[PDB]
Motif scaffolding. Structure first.
Motif, mmCIF file in Angstrom:
data_model
loop_
_atom_site.group_PDB
_atom_site.id
_atom_site.type_symbol
_atom_site.label_atom_id
_atom_site.label_comp_id
_atom_site.label_asym_id
_atom_site.label_seq_id
_atom_site.Cartn_x
_atom_site.Cartn_y
_atom_site.Cartn_z
ATOM 1 N N UNK A 153 -4.176 2.681 -20.228
ATOM 2 C CA UNK A 153 -4.492 2.376 -18.838
ATOM 3 C C UNK A 153 -3.818 1.085 -18.375
ATOM 4 N N UNK A 154 -3.046 1.187 -17.297
ATOM 5 C CA UNK A 154 -2.369 0.029 -16.731
ATOM 6 C C UNK A 154 -3.263 -0.685 -15.725
ATOM 7 N N UNK A 155 -4.437 -0.112 -15.477
ATOM 8 C CA UNK A 155 -5.393 -0.698 -14.546
ATOM 9 C C UNK A 155 -6.388 -1.589 -15.278
ATOM 10 N N UNK A 156 -6.784 -2.683 -14.635
ATOM 11 C CA UNK A 156 -7.728 -3.619 -15.229
ATOM 12 C C UNK A 156 -9.073 -3.584 -14.507
ATOM 13 N N UNK A 157 -10.105 -4.106 -15.162
ATOM 14 C CA UNK A 157 -11.450 -4.119 -14.595
ATOM 15 C C UNK A 157 -11.582 -5.160 -13.488
ATOM 16 N N UNK A 158 -11.199 -6.396 -13.795
ATOM 17 C CA UNK A 158 -11.266 -7.482 -12.824
ATOM 18 C C UNK A 158 -9.908 -8.153 -12.660
ATOM 19 N N UNK A 159 -9.813 -9.060 -11.693
ATOM 20 C CA UNK A 159 -8.570 -9.776 -11.435
ATOM 21 C C UNK A 159 -8.235 -10.719 -12.587
ATOM 22 N N UNK A 160 -9.266 -11.279 -13.207
ATOM 23 C CA UNK A 160 -9.082 -12.178 -14.338
ATOM 24 C C UNK A 160 -8.452 -11.446 -15.519
ATOM 25 N N UNK A 161 -8.882 -10.207 -15.735
ATOM 26 C CA UNK A 161 -8.354 -9.387 -16.816
ATOM 27 C C UNK A 161 -6.873 -9.094 -16.600
ATOM 28 N N UNK A 162 -6.506 -8.833 -15.349
ATOM 29 C CA UNK A 162 -5.125 -8.556 -15.001
ATOM 30 C C UNK A 162 -4.213 -9.733 -15.288
ATOM 31 N N UNK B 83 -10.037 -0.457 -8.991
ATOM 32 C CA UNK B 83 -10.721 -0.114 -7.750
ATOM 33 C C UNK B 83 -10.458 -1.156 -6.669
ATOM 34 N N UNK B 84 -10.030 -0.695 -5.499
ATOM 35 C CA UNK B 84 -9.741 -1.585 -4.391
ATOM 36 C C UNK B 84 -8.652 -1.047 -3.486
ATOM 37 N N UNK B 85 -8.420 -1.733 -2.372
ATOM 38 C CA UNK B 85 -7.408 -1.318 -1.410
ATOM 39 C C UNK B 85 -6.016 -1.340 -2.027
ATOM 40 N N UNK B 86 -5.825 -2.214 -3.009
ATOM 41 C CA UNK B 86 -4.540 -2.334 -3.686
ATOM 42 C C UNK B 86 -4.164 -1.029 -4.379
ATOM 43 N N UNK B 87 -5.086 -0.502 -5.177
ATOM 44 C CA UNK B 87 -4.858 0.751 -5.890
ATOM 45 C C UNK B 87 -4.780 1.926 -4.924
ATOM 46 N N UNK B 88 -5.717 1.973 -3.983
ATOM 47 C CA UNK B 88 -5.767 3.052 -3.002
ATOM 48 C C UNK B 88 -4.526 3.055 -2.113
ATOM 49 N N UNK B 89 -3.845 1.917 -2.047
ATOM 50 C CA UNK B 89 -2.633 1.803 -1.248
ATOM 51 C C UNK B 89 -1.525 2.690 -1.794
ATOM 52 N N UNK B 90 -1.217 2.524 -3.075
ATOM 53 C CA UNK B 90 -0.170 3.307 -3.721
ATOM 54 C C UNK B 90 -0.506 4.793 -3.729
ATOM 55 N N UNK C 77 3.238 4.805 -8.090
ATOM 56 C CA UNK C 77 1.916 5.395 -8.261
ATOM 57 C C UNK C 77 1.945 6.528 -9.278
ATOM 58 N N UNK C 78 2.973 7.367 -9.199
ATOM 59 C CA UNK C 78 3.128 8.476 -10.131
ATOM 60 C C UNK C 78 3.103 7.973 -11.571
ATOM 61 N N UNK C 79 3.766 6.844 -11.805
ATOM 62 C CA UNK C 79 3.802 6.232 -13.128
ATOM 63 C C UNK C 79 2.432 5.705 -13.540
ATOM 64 N N UNK C 80 1.840 4.876 -12.684
ATOM 65 C CA UNK C 80 0.553 4.256 -12.977
ATOM 66 C C UNK C 80 -0.566 5.288 -13.107
ATOM 67 N N UNK C 81 -0.413 6.412 -12.414
ATOM 68 C CA UNK C 81 -1.443 7.445 -12.392
ATOM 69 C C UNK C 81 -1.623 8.118 -13.749
#
Lengths: 127, 197, 174, 44, 48
Positions: B57-66, B29-36, B48-52
């Motif tokens: 899940x290639x998405x993380x909860x927080x920045x630390x997790x990433x 969640x954030x402008x970063x994800x909403x950007x793609x 985005x098509x790939x990550x979607x």
């Protein structure tokens, strides 16, 4: 570094050769004769050394070793043929750390006036 | 092996789309994800098509997790985030992360002031003045690189190492010939003859 | 024994020179900005002068292979020096004990084998230094020096075998 | 689609010519066979 | 007379007894060395 490695390879091989070769007579007679040839000819792609078979191991493991080598640098090159592809001044700090490559700006403009007024470490030296 | 290794090599964001071996994602969640998601640009579209639909899940909860995912994937996972926070992470122990390529878009932070405020024009000019005096760049260097913990972390040469092991073991052969021959000469011969008389 | 008296001279003076070489700590300056005047025991730094011993190679009661190889880079200095010193102990050994039979020759062999392990030491050393460009001449000194002393008193050893054994054998051909 | 992907392989084939070890070796054993059978046979 | 040809030839292709003088010695190791680099070379060129 590796060139020195192979150098002292020569040196150790050679001397030890004479050493095993030292019947003192025959020993030295075969030591002086061959040592050089081995620590040399044997270096490049490899007449008859044998006696002690304690010197054997030296000779064979030599032929082995130098052999590994010649293979090694050889294919090493063939790669250098293939790869080694042209590469390059990364940052501005690189321009200040060296002098071989000259550099400058426009004689008039904000670009030139930038370095002149810049109080930053790197850009200072550049100006 | 030689060129296979040496012929090996990486560009920018386009490099992430052209390959699949290395997974990558953004914050859930954030402008970063909403950007793609909203981006109509060629490269970013495919990404985005790939990550979607990427699993897991290639998405993380927080920045630390990433960041943790990048440090524990042995280079199999890339994380997309704000350059500012990224550059800072690169200057933090154990200094095992680095930013690659230029930014994907152009953003910028600014001093916010209530609409129709008195501090409005003054602050605006102040920011411009600070930047021209290089004071802004100075401040960043102070907190990012100078205060950083990572200034420690080329030319593609020969293999000398393994080769050198060969040197040593090879030497084991040397000294082996040495002693064995020694005690056999002096001791075998000198033994027998010693016992002769 | 003019040739061979000189061989002795080369022997002992060689030895002293050897250990002076070993002290040669200047193995390089590696200037990082520092500059590093980096001995065998420690590595010393430079502007502001600094120094440090071995960082690591240096602890952790770990086992198996690559770990034990760290332990090696610790030990590798201790592979270097002692062999050399022992070679020296010989060298004097047949400096004085030349006069008096075999031990002379026996010894002298043991002398120059001890002398022999030295370059091994070196290689060890450099590849320790290959844990991670300039260098120092102390190396080169040592490396050549061993070769020298070795050749010299060994060729002597030959002269012992010849003179004693063959020449005195013939002296007994009576 | 899920397939736009479909070269790190590095190895050594022991197998391939190891067969030629085999044949070569049968050659060895027979070679010595013929050897001592003519040596023994003809000679003795 | 005996050896010269063999060297300037056989020695050319991948490298029987030269040794006596030690004079020619150095020159021969020079040879093996030299041609050796060579053959190495044309072969690498090949694979390329």
């Amino acid at each position: 570094e590796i060139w020195m490695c192979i150098v002292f390879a020569y040196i150790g091989v050679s001397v030890v050769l004479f050493l095993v070769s030292r019947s003192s007579e025959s020993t030295n007679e075969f030591g002086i004769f061959n040592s050089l040839w081995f620590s040399l000819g044997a270096f490049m792609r490899q007449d008859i050394s044998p006696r002690s078979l304690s010197g054997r191991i030296v000779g064979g493991v030599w032929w082995f070793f130098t052999l590994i080598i010649i293979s090694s640098y050889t294919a090493n090159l063939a790669a250098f043929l293939t790869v080694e592809r042209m590469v390059s001044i990364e940052s501005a700090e690189d321009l200040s750390k060296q002098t071989e490559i000259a550099y400058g700006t426009l004689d008039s403009g904000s670009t030139k006036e930038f370095f002149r007024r810049s109080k930053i470490a790197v850009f200072d030296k550049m100006w | 092996f030689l060129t296979v290794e040496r012929m090996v090599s990486i560009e920018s964001a386009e490099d992430l789309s052209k390959q699949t071996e290395i997974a990558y994602g953004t914050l859930d969640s954030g402008s970063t994800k909403e950007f793609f998601r909203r981006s109509k640009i060629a490269v970013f579209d495919k990404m985005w098509t790939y990550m979607r639909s990427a699993e897991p899940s290639v998405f993380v909860r927080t920045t630390a997790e990433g960041v943790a995912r990048v440090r524990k994937s042995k280079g199999k996972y890339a994380y997309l985030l704000e350059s500012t926070m990224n550059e800072y992470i690169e200057q933090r122990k154990p200094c095992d992360t680095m930013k690659v390529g230029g930014n994907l878009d152009s953003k910028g932070y600014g001093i916010a002031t209530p609409k129709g405020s008195s501090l409005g024009n003054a602050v605006n000019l102040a920011v411009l003045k600070l930047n021209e005096q290089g004071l802004l760049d100075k401040l960043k260097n102070k907190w990012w690189y100078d205060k950083g913990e990572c200034g420690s972390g080329k030319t593609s040469a020969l293999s000398l190492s393994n080769v050198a092991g060969v040197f040593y073991i090879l030497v084991g052969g040397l000294g082996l010939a040495m002693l064995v021959a020694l005690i056999e000469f002096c001791y075998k011969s000198r033994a027998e003859a010693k016992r002769m008389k | 024994r003019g040739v061979q008296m000189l061989l002795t001279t080369v022997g002992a003076f060689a030895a002293f020179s050897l250990m002076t070489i070993a002290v040669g700590t200047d193995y390089w300056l590696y200037s990082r900005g520092e500059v590093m005047t980096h001995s065998g025991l420690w590595r010393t730094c430079c502007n502001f002068k600094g120094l440090c011993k071995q960082i690591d190679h240096p602890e952790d009661a770990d086992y198996e292979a690559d770990t034990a190889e760290y332990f090696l880079r610790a030990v590798r200095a201790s592979s270097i020096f002692p062999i050399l010193s022992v070679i020296l102990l010989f060298m004097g050994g047949l400096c004085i004990a030349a006069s008096e039979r075999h031990n002379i020759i026996l010894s002298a062999g043991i002398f120059f084998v001890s002398a022999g392990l030295s370059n091994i030491i070196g290689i060890i050393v450099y590849i320790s230094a290959n844990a991670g460009y300039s260098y120092g001449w102390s190396f080169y000194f040592g490396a050549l020096s061993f070769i020298i002393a070795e050749m010299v008193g060994v060729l002597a050893v030959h002269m012992f075998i010849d003179r004693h054994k063959q020449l005195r054998a013939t002296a007994r051909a009576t | 689609g899920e397939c736009g992907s479909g070269e790190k392989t590095s190895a050594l084939s022991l197998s391939n010519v190891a067969g030629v070890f085999y044949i070569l070796v049968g050659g060895l054993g027979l070679a010595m066979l013929v050897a001592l059978i003519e040596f023994c046979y003809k000679s003795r």
